[PDB]
Amino acid sequence: SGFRKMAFPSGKVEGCMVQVTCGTTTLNGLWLDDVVYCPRHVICTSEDMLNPNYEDLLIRKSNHNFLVQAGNVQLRVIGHSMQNCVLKLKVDTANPKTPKYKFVRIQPGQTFSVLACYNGSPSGVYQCAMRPNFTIKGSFLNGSCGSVGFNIDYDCVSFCYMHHMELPTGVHAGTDLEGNFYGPFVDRQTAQAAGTDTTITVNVLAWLYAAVINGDRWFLNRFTTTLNDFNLVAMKYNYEPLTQDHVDILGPLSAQTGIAVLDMCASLKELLQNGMNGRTILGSALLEDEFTPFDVVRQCSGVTFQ
Amino acid sequence: SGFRKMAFPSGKVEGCMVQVTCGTTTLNGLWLDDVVYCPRHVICTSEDMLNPNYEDLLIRKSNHNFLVQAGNVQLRVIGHSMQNCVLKLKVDTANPKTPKYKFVRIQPGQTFSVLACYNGSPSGVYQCAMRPNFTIKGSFLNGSCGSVGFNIDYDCVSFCYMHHMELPTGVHAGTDLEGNFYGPFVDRQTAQAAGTDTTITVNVLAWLYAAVINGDRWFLNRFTTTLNDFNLVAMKYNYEPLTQDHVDILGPLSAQTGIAVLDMCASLKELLQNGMNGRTILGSALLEDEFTPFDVVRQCSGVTF
Ligand SMILES: CCN1CCN(c2ccc(NC(=O)CN3Cc4ccc(Cl)cc4[C@H](C(=O)Nc4cncc5ccccc45)C3)cc2)CC1
Ligand SMILES: CCN1CCN(c2ccc(NC(=O)CN3Cc4ccc(Cl)cc4[C@H](C(=O)Nc4cncc5ccccc45)C3)cc2)CC1
Ligand SMILES: [Cl-]
């Protein structure tokens, strides 16, 4: 029993974290095989961040301008190239700790673990969701750039996020490992803002199924609804629309608990219209949207990664 | 910016997890140097659990009855001993991945990371706290026994908890790494129940200071309180008493934000009376008590917004 915001075990990623220094700037890099991946803004000064021409800045750098430290060992940079907003530093040593891995781009609503790092040293691990507005509500201070997000499937690490910046509201923006930003952001000092966010409906429903599995049933009712009527109510409370794909994905949880997805939607409608009335669900007074249907099934079944 | 329930990176502990088998029972063990530590109830059947005589069950076992698997490698048990509720299996190979470590016993209110494991394989990592009633609100299924709790301040792992059982309310009980239980619990299937739990006041105060550091002051008020008047109110809401030790420990957060501890105590009294009125604090609609003063200082910026 119990239900916690659980991250993947971080060891396979810890063995890839390095420190990248260039000029005044020090940030984190990801060392996989003989390449170190890091944000391309490591080559910028504070003045450069206003109007940066990254090719012009890069052409002026020699391999020896990039100092890469893996633990207490200095790596030798033997090449450099740029891919979108990610800098790739070719090094003379393949990482002996390189796990089986893939670079994957995730969709809003999908969750992943973040290994927060400073000076190439991992400091913490937490779970988070890619918001519908493409930001993440992370916990990052200055020096955290280059920290990565990932998921694990069997023994394979799927890297999905690299941290680049903090927006004015305190939320975070970054890229996939191919350097494509999540959201309409740019890697420079200009007026940028997180757009209006919405709640991840399919994830709230998954978490309501997790609560039922854990014995919290007070919110259940005899009613059902239609996908069309539910979506009219979801639009009113700034919830993302629920699709037939979301209903299909929740099929296993519906069969296990005996509560159809539209039966749970009627519970969710009543919760939106009435509130919790002093009660909590899984120890929360808010409707939690950072657990996917897969996360719920995994945590309620004990899937392992050795 | 931001404030998350953050766990320590788990790699140093993942390299110590092994599977321990004794007859039909399989659970997790912690392999440090040449010793594997695990719950002694691995030697029990379900019938043995009502009133097990562990000394009598253990004397009937030999080294070769314990099967220890580290990854896909079978370790050889060359000795065994019981220390309180933990079994220590001496093995013929020192763990090459043994980190720098210590065994520490924690007090209620302390937080730690749990690496949940099944069959010697890590499945997930989360943060939790030793409740005032000595239980932990974990997320554990059958097969999780032997999973450990730890902190990694600097590069040394301080192991503080080993999981032994789930109580009837769904909460969890276990021991330190010397096998002493936290709380009045026993590794017996007998009528045992978690006592009435309370809120960790010093941790709620720390988290209110974290909210002020991150830029939020809506809950502050113009009042102060004596320590005794605060305690008289807080206990009416099932909050733990705040001691002078707690006030002293909050000193650094008070100096950083400019808000005296007893002034933050007045704010907490008002929140307990009024609720949040549709507002949230650090993304929560409840008062959070699983961040200690030390956790707030470690995670938050040293510059208040
Ligand atoms: C709740 C109220 N808060 C909201 C957030 N706010 C704030 C003020 C200033 C900055 N940034 C800088 O000073 C320079 N950056 C420019 C910049 C441009 C573009 C790119 Cl691609 C990267 C960067 C880098 C950056 O954003 N770094 C980071 C990343 N994560 C957390 C970080 C945490 C703190 C300061 C940097 C942080 C440096 C960021 C946030 C304060 C008030
Ligand atoms: C209101 C909802 N209720 C529903 C009922 N529930 C519940 C909790 C525990 C068990 N335990 C067993 O069946 C056998 N254990 C006896 C036992 C005795 C003594 C000792 Cl020292 C260890 C053990 C071991 C044990 O507790 N294992 C574990 C550990 N962690 C989580 C675990 C999660 C599930 C089943 C085992 C779990 C096996 C049964 C039902 C509580 C919540
Ligand atoms: Cl302690």
Side-chain angles (χ1 to χ4, degrees):
Chain A
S1 315
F3 204 69
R4 284 282 182 178
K5 187 137 284 174
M6 192 176 280
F8 280 100
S10 58
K12 285 173 165 66
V13 178
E14 293 167 52
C16 302
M17 306 306 310
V18 299
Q19 184 190 61
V20 178
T21 295
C22 200
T24 171
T25 306
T26 290
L27 46 64
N28 306 283
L30 183 68
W31 182 28
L32 295 170
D33 302 309
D34 58 352
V35 179
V36 170
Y37 302 80
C38 77
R40 67 177 183 175
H41 73 248
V42 69
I43 72 178
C44 299
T45 69
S46 302
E47 163 59 57
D48 286 320
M49 290 313 289
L50 314 169
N51 194 84
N53 185 310
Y54 287 102
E55 184 173 37
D56 193 58
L57 296 174
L58 194 50
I59 64 95
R60 308 165 185 267
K61 313 294 246 164
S62 76
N63 292 326
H64 270 255
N65 290 149
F66 302 97
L67 304 176
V68 180
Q69 191 177 318
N72 265 114
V73 178
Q74 209 70 18
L75 298 182
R76 181 186 154 111
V77 175
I78 65 167
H80 59 270
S81 68
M82 187 169 284
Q83 177 177 18
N84 301 312
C85 306
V86 150
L87 179 62
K88 300 191 277 189
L89 304 174
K90 196 71 159 164
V91 290
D92 78 344
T93 306
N95 187 358
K97 293 184 175 177
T98 306
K100 188 175 160 172
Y101 77 93
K102 289 181 290 110
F103 286 172
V104 300
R105 184 174 177 89
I106 64 165
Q107 286 263 78
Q110 299 193 302
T111 58
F112 55 98
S113 298
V114 170
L115 179 63
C117 294
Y118 296 90
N119 297 295
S121 185
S123 60
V125 62
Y126 58 85
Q127 187 70 0
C128 72
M130 175 54 64
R131 301 308 309 173
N133 71 0
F134 290 105
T135 69
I136 75 173
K137 296 182 193 177
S139 175
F140 287 128
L141 305 172
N142 187 51
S144 58
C145 301
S147 294
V148 300
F150 62 99
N151 284 287
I152 309 185
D153 285 286
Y154 307 153
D155 64 325
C156 183
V157 181
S158 296
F159 294 105
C160 61
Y161 177 85
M162 177 170 270
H163 185 52
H164 287 242
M165 61 182 314
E166 182 170 296
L167 294 171
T169 54
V171 303
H172 303 100
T175 68
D176 57 29
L177 269 294
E178 295 184 296
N180 302 295
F181 259 93
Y182 285 101
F185 305 110
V186 298
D187 53 353
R188 57 188 166 87
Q189 180 58 244
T190 193
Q192 311 193 66
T196 297
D197 202 27
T198 50
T199 299
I200 312 155
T201 313
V202 64
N203 285 5
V204 173
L205 289 167
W207 170 85
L208 289 178
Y209 280 112
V212 174
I213 291 168
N214 275 275
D216 241 325
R217 308 181 69 91
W218 66 258
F219 51 78
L220 300 176
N221 65 26
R222 68 160 60 229
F223 304 110
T224 190
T225 189
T226 65
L227 196 52
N228 285 355
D229 282 351
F230 177 76
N231 283 327
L232 282 171
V233 173
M235 193 168 280
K236 186 177 134 156
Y237 296 89
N238 279 342
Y239 267 57
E240 283 292 289
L242 193 74
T243 67
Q244 183 62 41
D245 199 40
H246 294 149
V247 173
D248 289 353
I249 291 164
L250 291 161
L253 290 170
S254 170
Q256 178 185 337
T257 63
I259 302 155
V261 174
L262 296 167
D263 183 354
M264 192 68 90
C265 281
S267 267
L268 181 48
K269 160 185 54 173
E270 303 305 324
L271 289 169
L272 291 173
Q273 303 173 343
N274 299 336
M276 289 200 190
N277 308 337
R279 293 168 291 197
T280 59
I281 296 169
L282 290 171
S284 178
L286 292 178
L287 300 180
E288 168 81 63
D289 73 346
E290 297 204 350
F291 294 98
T292 73
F294 299 99
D295 292 342
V296 171
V297 166
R298 196 178 299 112
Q299 183 171 171
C300 302
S301 86
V303 166
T304 68
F305 316 87
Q306 202 261 159
Chain B
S1 179
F3 205 73
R4 285 281 186 173
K5 189 139 281 176
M6 193 178 276
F8 280 98
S10 60
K12 285 174 169 64
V13 178
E14 294 169 49
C16 301
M17 304 308 309
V18 299
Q19 184 190 63
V20 179
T21 305
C22 167
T24 186
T25 307
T26 290
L27 45 64
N28 306 284
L30 181 69
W31 181 29
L32 295 169
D33 300 311
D34 58 351
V35 180
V36 170
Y37 302 80
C38 75
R40 65 177 181 175
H41 74 247
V42 69
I43 71 180
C44 299
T45 69
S46 303
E47 200 201 333
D48 286 318
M49 291 313 290
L50 284 141
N51 289 288
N53 188 309
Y54 288 102
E55 291 80 6
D56 194 60
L57 296 171
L58 192 54
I59 198 68
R60 307 167 184 270
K61 313 293 243 72
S62 68
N63 294 329
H64 56 277
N65 292 152
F66 299 100
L67 304 178
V68 179
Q69 191 178 319
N72 265 113
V73 178
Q74 209 69 19
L75 298 182
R76 196 171 65 93
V77 175
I78 64 168
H80 61 272
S81 69
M82 179 166 62
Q83 175 178 20
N84 301 310
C85 305
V86 300
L87 183 62
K88 298 191 279 186
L89 305 175
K90 197 72 159 163
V91 290
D92 212 25
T93 307
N95 187 359
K97 292 184 188 162
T98 305
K100 187 176 159 54
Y101 77 93
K102 291 181 292 187
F103 285 171
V104 177
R105 185 174 174 86
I106 63 168
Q107 290 308 304
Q110 188 56 267
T111 61
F112 55 96
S113 298
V114 170
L115 179 64
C117 295
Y118 297 91
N119 296 291
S121 294
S123 60
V125 62
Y126 57 85
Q127 188 74 354
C128 66
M130 175 57 59
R131 301 307 308 173
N133 71 359
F134 292 105
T135 69
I136 76 170
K137 296 184 192 177
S139 172
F140 286 128
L141 305 174
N142 175 251
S144 59
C145 302
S147 293
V148 300
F150 62 99
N151 284 288
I152 315 181
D153 309 296
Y154 320 117
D155 236 21
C156 178
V157 181
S158 45
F159 293 104
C160 59
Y161 177 84
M162 176 171 270
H163 185 53
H164 286 241
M165 67 170 174
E166 185 169 293
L167 294 170
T169 54
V171 302
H172 304 104
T175 68
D176 57 28
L177 270 294
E178 296 185 301
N180 298 119
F181 260 91
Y182 287 105
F185 307 107
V186 290
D187 54 353
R188 237 174 108 198
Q189 178 57 242
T190 213
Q192 305 192 72
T196 303
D197 202 30
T198 50
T199 301
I200 309 156
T201 312
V202 65
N203 285 4
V204 174
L205 290 168
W207 170 86
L208 291 177
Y209 279 112
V212 175
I213 288 169
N214 285 197
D216 209 348
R217 300 182 50 105
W218 70 256
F219 47 77
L220 301 176
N221 68 22
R222 72 188 212 277
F223 302 111
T224 194
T225 183
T226 62
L227 184 55
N228 201 62
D229 281 351
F230 175 78
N231 283 327
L232 284 171
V233 173
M235 299 178 214
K236 296 171 186 181
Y237 294 93
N238 278 342
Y239 268 56
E240 280 294 288
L242 193 74
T243 69
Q244 186 58 218
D245 274 12
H246 296 146
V247 173
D248 289 353
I249 290 164
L250 291 160
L253 289 171
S254 170
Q256 180 181 338
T257 64
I259 301 156
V261 173
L262 293 175
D263 286 9
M264 193 62 78
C265 289
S267 177
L268 180 47
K269 288 163 77 184
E270 186 168 283
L271 283 170
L272 291 172
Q273 169 189 276
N274 302 347
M276 289 197 191
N277 197 8
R279 293 167 290 198
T280 58
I281 295 171
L282 291 171
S284 177
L286 288 182
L287 302 182
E288 293 290 310
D289 74 347
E290 297 202 349
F291 295 99
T292 66
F294 187 98
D295 289 348
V296 170
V297 164
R298 184 164 193 275
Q299 183 174 170
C300 292
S301 173
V303 176
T304 297
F305 177 52

